[PDB]
Amino acid sequence: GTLYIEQFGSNMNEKVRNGKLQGIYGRDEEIRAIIESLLRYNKNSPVLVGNPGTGKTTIVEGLVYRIEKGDVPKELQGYTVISLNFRKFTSGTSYRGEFETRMKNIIKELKNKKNKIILFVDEIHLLLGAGKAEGGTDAANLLKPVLSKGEIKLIGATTIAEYRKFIESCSAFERRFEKILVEPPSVDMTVKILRSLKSKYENFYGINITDKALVAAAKISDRFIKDRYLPDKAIDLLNKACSFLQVQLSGKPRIIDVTERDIERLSYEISTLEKDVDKVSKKKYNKLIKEFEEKKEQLKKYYEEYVITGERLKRKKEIEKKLNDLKELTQNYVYSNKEPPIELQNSLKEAQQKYLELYKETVAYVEAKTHNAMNVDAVYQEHVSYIYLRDSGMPLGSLSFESSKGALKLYNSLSKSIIGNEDIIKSLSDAVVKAATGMKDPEKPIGTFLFLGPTGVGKTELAKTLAIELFNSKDNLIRVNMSEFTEAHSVSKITGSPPGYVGFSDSGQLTEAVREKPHSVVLFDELEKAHADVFKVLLQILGDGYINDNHRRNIDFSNTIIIMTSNLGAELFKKKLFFDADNSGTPEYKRVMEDVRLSLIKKCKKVFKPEFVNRIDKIGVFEPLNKKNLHKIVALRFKKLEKRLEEKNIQVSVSEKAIDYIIDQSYDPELGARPTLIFIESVIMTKFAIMYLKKELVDDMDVFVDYNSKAKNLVINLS
Amino acid sequence: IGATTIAEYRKFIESCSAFERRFEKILVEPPSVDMTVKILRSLKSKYENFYGINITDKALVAAAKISDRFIKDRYLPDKAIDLLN
Numbered sequence: 001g002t003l004y005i006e007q008f009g010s011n012m013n014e015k016v017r018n019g020k021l022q023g024i025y026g027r028d029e030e031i032r033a034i035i036e037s038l039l040r041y042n043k044n045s046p047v048l049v050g051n052p053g054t055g056k057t058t059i060v061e062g063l064v065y066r067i068e069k070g071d072v073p074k075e076l077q078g079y080t081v082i083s084l085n086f087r088k089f090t091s092g093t094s095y096r097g098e099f100e101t102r103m104k105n106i107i108k109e110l111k112n113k114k115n116k117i118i119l120f121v122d123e124i125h126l127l128l129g130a131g132k133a134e135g136g137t138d139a140a141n142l143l144k145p146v147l148s149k150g151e152i153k154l155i156g157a158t159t160i161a162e163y164r165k166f167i168e169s170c171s172a173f174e175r176r177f178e179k180i181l182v183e184p185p186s187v188d189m190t191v192k193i194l195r196s197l198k199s200k201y202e203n204f205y206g207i208n209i210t211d212k213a214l215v216a217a218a219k220i221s222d223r224f225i226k227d228r229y230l231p232d233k234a235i236d237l238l239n240k241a242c243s244f245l246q247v248q249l250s251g252k253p254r255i256i257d258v259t260e261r262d263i264e265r266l267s268y269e270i271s272t273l274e275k276d277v278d279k280v281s282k283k284k285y286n287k288l289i290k291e292f293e294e295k296k297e298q299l300k301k302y303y304e305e306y307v308i309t310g311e312r313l314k315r316k317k318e319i320e321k322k323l324n325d326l327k328e329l330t331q332n333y334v335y336s337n338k339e340p341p342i343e344l345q346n347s348l349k350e351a352q353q354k355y356l357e358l359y360k361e362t363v364a365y366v367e368a369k370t371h372n373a374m375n376v377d378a379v380y381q382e383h384v385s386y387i388y389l390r391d392s393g394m395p396l397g398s399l400s401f402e403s404s405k406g407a408l409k410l411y412n413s414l415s416k417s418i419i420g421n422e423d424i425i426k427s428l429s430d431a432v433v434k435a436a437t438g439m440k441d442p443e444k445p446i447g448t449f450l451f452l453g454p455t456g457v458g459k460t461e462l463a464k465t466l467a468i469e470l471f472n473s474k475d476n477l478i479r480v481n482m483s484e485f486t487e488a489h490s491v492s493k494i495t496g497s498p499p500g501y502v503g504f505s506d507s508g509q510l511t512e513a514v515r516e517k518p519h520s521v522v523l524f525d526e527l528e529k530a531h532a533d534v535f536k537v538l539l540q541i542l543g544d545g546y547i548n549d550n551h552r553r554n555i556d557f558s559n560t561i562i563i564m565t566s567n568l569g570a571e572l573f574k575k576k577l578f579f580d581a582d583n584s585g586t587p588e589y590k591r592v593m594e595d596v597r598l599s600l601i602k603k604c605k606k607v608f609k610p611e612f613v614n615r616i617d618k619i620g621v622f623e624p625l626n627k628k629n630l631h632k633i634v635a636l637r638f639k640k641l642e643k644r645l646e647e648k649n650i651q652v653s654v655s656e657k658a659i660d661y662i663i664d665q666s667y668d669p670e671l672g673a674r675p676t677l678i679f680i681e682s683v684i685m686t687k688f689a690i691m692y693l694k695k696e697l698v699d700d701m702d703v704f705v706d707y708n709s710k711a712k713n714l715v716i717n718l719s
Numbered sequence: 720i721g722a723t724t725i726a727e728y729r730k731f732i733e734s735c736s737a738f739e740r741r742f743e744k745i746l747v748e749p750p751s752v753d754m755t756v757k758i759l760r761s762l763k764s765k766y767e768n769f770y771g772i773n774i775t776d777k778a779l780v781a782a783a784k785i786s787d788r789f790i791k792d793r794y795l796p797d798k799a800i801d802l803l804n
């Protein structure tokens with residue numbers, strides 16, 4: 001067959017006869033349209049115009065598969081299909097005959113009936129650059145008069161943008177090529193492709209793929225990605241699964257490599273005999289000894305559980321001979337029974353009492369480990385998301401991986417750092433609970449909130465804690481300084497400048513930054529100070545993820561928690577100072593608060609244009625702090641001084657008098673206990689941070705704070 | 720058995736497209752430098768003789784690390800030969 005190729009390019013049909021091209025899944029309407037456009041009275045050149053993820057190139061291999069197998073009309077039987085550019089982009093670099101040997105040996109080969117070659121081009125827009133030289137015109141312009149003949153046949157495929165920029169610019173080279181649009185396949189069709197490739201991956205890779213992984217491989221990638229079109233994403237995620245399981249399950253798992261290093265390299269070298277004196281910094285070296293003891297729990301526990309999951313594997317040796325073989329040996333066409341009460345209904349109970357007990361425990365190990373599941377050959381749905389979460393802006397673990405234990409303790413962990421208004425937290429934490437499960441809204445962004453409240457309470461602090469907990473980083477916190485966006489002209493800074501104006505290279509300040517981190521909270525600082533035109537864009541933001549850039553690409557605001565604090569604290573309701581600073585009088589506080597909250601909602605109609613209120617999932621009024629609440633906050637702020645300022649050895653303690661001294665002095669109703677964050681930095685931190693002798697510098701800080709209540713600073717040096 | 724360099728055969732030797740399947744490859748490896756130090760210890764037997772100068776073994780071990788770090792071309796085992804010369 002090399003006589004017709006002229007040994008550049010390749011015949012497709014010989015590769016079909018080799019074991020290299022199996023049967024392509026049905027794109028039955030798309031292929032038969034090309035067969036009609038190939039047999040024609042003139043111009044004989046279908047082009048697969050379509051998206052980059054269409055798989056149009058593969059389709060042609062499905063057509064060649066129909067050529068060799070004979071599912072084609074009689075006029076098209078026996079043709080050889082040849083791709084043109086495999087040696088180089090110029091199909092042969094000549095250097096002896098610079099125009100004779102290549103262009104004339106192809107067009108001459110289109111001759112009489114026994115020459116049944118069919119040309120094929122991978123990208124037809126590179127032909128506009130082919131033959132480009134100072135002394136010679138493009139090879140595509142030479143093929144333009146050739147296409148008015150019945151002997152030439154061409155099939156090509158480009159992206160839509162390269163079809164616009166290159167093919168349509170010539171407008172006569174555009175004309176003799178027939179459009180056949182390759183529509184991207186629907187969501188259900190991408191599932192039907194992956195069911196064809198189970199026999200590929202379970203034979204050529206050997207790993208098993210559950211059907212729960214197949215449905216998740218399409219549907220997770222579709223709603224969460226708005227480029228690199230559909231059928232590649234359903235296939236490339238499972239192609240990442242073929243390399244993910246192969247490196248690890250055949251060899252040692254990754255978790256053994258991580259717990260091994262920590263105990264010996266840093267916690268063992270510092271614990272040695274080098275400093276037994278304990279005179280310089282006597283508090284610190286007591287803690288360095290304790291660090292070695294807990295790290296013994298790392299090595300021993302996972303090793304035995306690896307045997308326990310390894311115990312499941314030799315139960316998998318047993319099911320091969322009983323559940324797999326006994327169905328495949330006795331059950332045949334000869335009378336189809338072979339005494340079904342013996343050995344055959346017993347095997348049905350073996351499917352229930354051996355396999356399903358193995359099956360449930362392997363399923364139960366999926367919620368246990370949630371990624372890098374040891375001794376587990378089947379692909380699972382949570383491992384499919386783990387491959388996606390590698391690609392998205394996620395750490396290796398922050399509370400989305402830790403399903404069904406971390407999501408419920410997320411309500412407990414937010415109650416640690418933030419104290420009041422747990423009913424808002426119940427609405428806040430359950431939105432994460434809906435996101436962690438299949439209770440997901442594909443249009444609406446998950447967790448939109450409107451944080452009205454008095455000035456001074458920790459409203460914006462929740463967005464800091466969710467970035468530290470749900471996303472393990474302050475990078476996923478995205479502040480929006482609405483004080484920059486007060487003007488009516490400032491609204492273009494959100495979505496970027498429109499085309500033809502100053503800028504336009506960036507898609508904007510906020511809208512660009514969400515594109516690389518779709519899993520991130522979106523903080524809006526203070527919605528009380530903005531022009532209402534800025535609110536007009538926000539109607540789409542809370543409404544859908546259909547936010548377009550200047551280049552009009554969608555931005556994925558799914559999995560974005562849109563926190564929108566705004567004060568209005570000064571204006572009225574919570575502005576009225578809680579008359580009774582009681583913790584919560586149930587017959588009083590509960591009744592009056594809702595009456596002000598209704599008013600707060602009523603006020604919104606006054607200003608936030610009540611269309612915007614319908615987009616809110618939960619308006620939450622924060623309760624203003626006083627002596628009962630403020631007494632409980634401040635000790636956790638000293639615990640924030642415990643975690644940050646130790647290692648350099650600071651471990652504070654508080655008393656009955658140590659909190660009472662702060663509350664009667666630093667509480668201001670007009671500022672709403674804001675200077676309680678200043679009274680810490682302004683007077684006791686002056687007793688800290690000194691050069692020498694007013695603070696123990698490196699040695700120890702085990703101080704127990706007390707005063708004689710004399711309205712003067714007396715730091716009793718008990719440290 | 721024949722031998723051609725890595726960057727060349729992609730353009731000219733692979734041109735025949737049927738010879739290329741019969742042009743099976745042998746991937747000559749990156750040197751694994753620390754085991755090439757034993758090569759220089761053997762080859763000094765002529766270099767101590769032809770130059771008449773005794774060569775310290777402690778110097779040639781550091782000669783590999785200079786070829787590793789300060790210079791980043793010429794396919795490392797060629798350099799440790801030249802720095803002895």
Ligand SMILES: Nc1ncnc2c1ncn2[C@@H]1O[C@H](COP(=O)(O)OP(=O)(O)OP(O)(O)=S)[C@@H](O)[C@H]1O
Binds near residue numbers: 025026052059193
């Ligand atoms: N109908 C189908 N049957 C079998 N496999 C398919 C089908 N559609 C897509 N695929 C797979 O998805 C891939 C699609 O390949 P292409 O998209 O042609 O890649 P390409 O040749 O680089 O051209 P691009 O990427 O579209 S610009 C192939 O490797 C196929 O394995």
Ligand SMILES: Nc1ncnc2c1ncn2[C@@H]1O[C@H](COP(=O)(O)OP(=O)(O)OP(O)(O)=S)[C@@H](O)[C@H]1O
Binds near residue numbers: 459
């Ligand atoms: N419920 C709370 N839980 C934890 N810390 C709190 C709480 N209320 C207030 N704080 C602390 O007090 C300060 C609150 O900061 P924020 O009030 O959130 O800033 P802000 O929200 O812009 O304030 P306003 O009300 O808009 S002026 C921080 O130092 C918090 O740590």
